[PDB]
Every structure is written in C-alpha cells, then in structure tokens.
C-alpha cells in the first residue's frame, strides 16, 4: 500500500485555461457555474498509480511500427523526445506518458471523424512510454497535419499531439497538447487562446531538435513537461 508523506504545490488556475472560454463553443455548456470547493490534501489526493509492472509491447512507443499492415506510414518522420520534471526541477521517474494524434492529413482513426482527408492504412495514432530513471521519454511518429472543426465557420486546429501524463499522484495527472514550432495556426486557434497568458502557450510549443535528429532518416522535436512540485510534509498536526 501507498502512504501519505507528500504534499503538492497548489495549482495556479489563472495560468491554466479557465473553464468558461466562449470562443471555444463547446465549453459554454460544459463548464461549472458554481465555484470549486477547496479541500486539503489527504491520502486520497496525494497517492496515485504506478505503472512499472504494466506489460508494454516492444513497439508501444513506435507509431511507425505499432499498427503495421505491411508498410510504413506516409508523412514527416519525427522523434518526439523530452523530460518530465516537477516544479522544483526534480525528475519524475517511471511515470506513464500516453499520446494520441491524427495522420499526415489531419484524419483520426475514429468513427466520428468524417473529414475528407483519407486514412493511412499503416498508421493508428496511439503511443505509450514509461519514463526512465532520469524522467526521459521518447516517441517515434509522423508529424500530424491540421484539421478543421465545427466551431467558427473557418476554424482550423494546428498540428498537434495530445498527451496524458500520470505523475506520482492523481493530483499531478495532466492531459495537455503539444504544438509545433513556428506553426502560424497557433495564435488563431480558440483552444490555444483559452490560455490567457502568452508565456503559458510557449510551454506547449515543441522546439526543433537537430541534435537529437537521425541523419538521413528522421527529424526530432523536444518537449519537456513540468508537473506539480512535490515536497515532504512538515509541521503538520503540530
């Protein structure tokens, strides 16, 4: 069993996007009108699942090989690497990082995606990696393309990869999106503009990593994730 020995730095809800962001239409009916009730951290909030004993497949992180129907996917071959640290800069080892995206044309392998860009018979779009001792993760995929959506009459989502990070607790569990360096669609997207601070948007932009690129093969992008700062309990209950 797990023990209550950790405390997590309180979330800055002015840094994160607000619940009600009108330009992103679906958020109007799906946001609370009442205020969130603040509760102190206990064993329920400070503990979380550890996925070290989960059986990962050999190609679970390799989106170029985990679907495979006798071929390679069409699109810009890239490596998406980075490190998962907390707010104190301390690495987060053996944590679960899950990712999903669309193909080179902006089409997802889902029944609800009725977009006219075709599917890639060799691309699924799912990945999962367990961070190492130093908090490092790596994925091999193709660069996803942008896609339109029914929000505004001419709205386009930028090229992105959705990310899900577990962390040491359910208090650190985060779901976010990675964007690509220089994409002109970033300042136009309502989901990106749900974030009020422009410095907060910068944390979501993956930078081109030529150093980590494989010559004559694939490019690379760096994306570091910062989870809530973990500290030990002190002076509690006197």
């Amino acid at each position: 069993p797990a023990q209550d020995n950790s405390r997590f730095v309180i979330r800055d809800r002015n840094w994160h996007p607000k619940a009600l962001t009108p330009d992103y239409k679906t958020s109007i009916a799906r946001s609370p009108r009442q205020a969130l009730v603040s509760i102190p951290q206990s064993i329920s909030e400070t503990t979380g699942p550890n996925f070290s004993h989960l059986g990962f497949g050999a190609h679970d992180h390799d989106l170029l090989l985990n679907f495979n129907n006798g071929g390679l996917p069409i699109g810009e071959r890239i490596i998406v690497a980075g490190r998962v640290v907390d707010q104190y800069g301390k690495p987060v080892p053996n944590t679960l990082v899950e990712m999903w995206q669309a193909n080179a044309g902006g089409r997802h392998r889902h029944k609800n995606d009725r977009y006219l860009a075709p599917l890639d018979p060799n691309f699924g779009g799912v990945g999962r990696c367990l961070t190492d001792s130093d908090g490092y993760y790596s994925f091999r995929t193709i660069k996803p393309g942008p896609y339109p959506w029914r929000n505004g009459p001419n709205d386009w989502r930028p090229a992105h990869i959705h990310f899900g990070i577990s962390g040491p607790s359910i208090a650190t569990k985060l779901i976010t999106q990675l964007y690509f360096e220089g994409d002109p669609l970033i300042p136009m997207c309502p989901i990106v503009k749900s974030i009020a601070n422009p410095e907060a948007v910068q944390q979501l932009i993956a930078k081109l990593d030529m150093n980590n690129a494989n010559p004559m093969d694939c490019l690379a992008y760096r994306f570091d994730i910062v989870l809530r700062g973990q500290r030990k309990t002190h002076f509690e209950n006197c």
């Binding site: 800055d12 809800r13 969130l36 907390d86 609800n112 899900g164 948007v201």
Partner: protein, 200 residues
C-alpha cells in the same frame, strides 16, 4: 516571492480522446495490456458492486464523449498503487461514455474507510476525474454511497461544503441490476443540481 517552474498548462482531452485512452470504446484494436473498468476480479475481497451513471451538460443534454478515471481504496481501506493486471484488485481504473453507450460502467468493490491528514476518518468514497471536449482542465469529484448515511454526516471533506443541498449531489443512489448490487451516479456539470467539484 519565490517563483518555481510553471506547471505545463492543461488542454481539453478533445473529441477523439478514446483513440489513445479507451481503444475498445473507439472501435479500434486493443493491445495486450489495457487499463480499463474492471478494478476487481470476481475473487477479490469485499462487497462487490457495479457503478453506473450518465454525464449531463448545462442544457440537460447527454455528454457522449466523456472519459473518466477513478482512484479508490480496497475493502480494508488501503490504496494499491502498484498497478498490475494479475492482481485481484487494482485501485485505479478507466471508463467512458460512447455514442452507443451513453452510460459508463465500473466493476469494483466498496472502498473501506481511510483517514485524512489530521487522522479523522472520511466516509467510503471514490475519487473521480472527468475529461471531455469542452472541458479545458479536468474536473475532480468524489462519489459517496447512500447506505453509508452515518459516516457521510461525519466526513470532514463532505462537511467542508457550506450548503447541505449541494452535498447530496456527491451521493450515489443504490439500485439493483440483475441481482448484483449497483449504485447510480449522475454528474451534472452545469446548471440545476450541479455536482460539487473540487480543488486540491
């Protein structure tokens, strides 16, 4: 003041959240090992229950693309963090609502009593995290049981909610589906009877 590294901002799970976190529910082929809605194997200790519920928006309409994650203690009130599919019980699980199944399900045991930081016992609860399109940052809530009325009135977390009428939204109503013990938990994100959400 002292400024630490800022946390990576949250973004909506999106409409296609299922392809990466709920493969079967997405109609796509699964992998060997998947994190899903069966926390307890039929041979696990404690009172075996079935949990179901629906998620409603502000207009009283169903949210058919929601994704939920649960975290609960075992029958002895202990959190089993080491996730393994060979275990009789796992504290973590994942469920979802699809266009086919506008209702989510979860097979588990009733959680035992756990204490807070001060050592005061909290009523049997299930920690829930709600993700969906239109929800920029996930919503945190707790599920309590109606047949635990005595413990519910003494809970230090449930008594932190000023108004008694709002405490009733976190309480799941007991029913019976096919001779199996079931509890129904409907979540109303916005409006009338709006469910209490937490911050911690």
């Amino acid at each position: 003041p002292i400024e630490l590294l800022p946390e990576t901002p949250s973004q909506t799970a999106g409409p296609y959240v299922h392809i990466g976190l709920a493969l079967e529910a997405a109609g796509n082929p699964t992998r060997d090992q998947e994190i899903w809605n069966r926390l307890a194997k039929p041979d696990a200790p404690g009172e075996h229950i079935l949990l179901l519920g629906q998620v409603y928006d502000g207009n009283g309409h169903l949210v058919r693309d929601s994704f939920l994650e649960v975290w609960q203690a075992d029958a002895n009130g202990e959190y089993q963090d080491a996730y393994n599919l060979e275990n009789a019980f796992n504290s973590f699980g994942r469920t979802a609502t699809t266009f086919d199944a506008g209702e989510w399900t979860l097979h588990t045991v009733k959680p035992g009593v756990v204490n807070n930081a001060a050592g005061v016992p909290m009523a049997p609860h299930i920690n829930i995290s709600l993700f969906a399109r239109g929800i920029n940052i996930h919503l945190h809530t707790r599920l309590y049981f109606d047949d635990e009325a005595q413990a519910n009135a003494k809970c230090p977390v449930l008594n932190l909610i000023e108004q008694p009428q709002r405490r009733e939204t976190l309480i799941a109503k007991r029913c019976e589906v096919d001779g199996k013990t079931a509890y129904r938990f409907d979540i109303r994100i916005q409006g009338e009877g709006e469910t209490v959400f937490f911050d911690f």
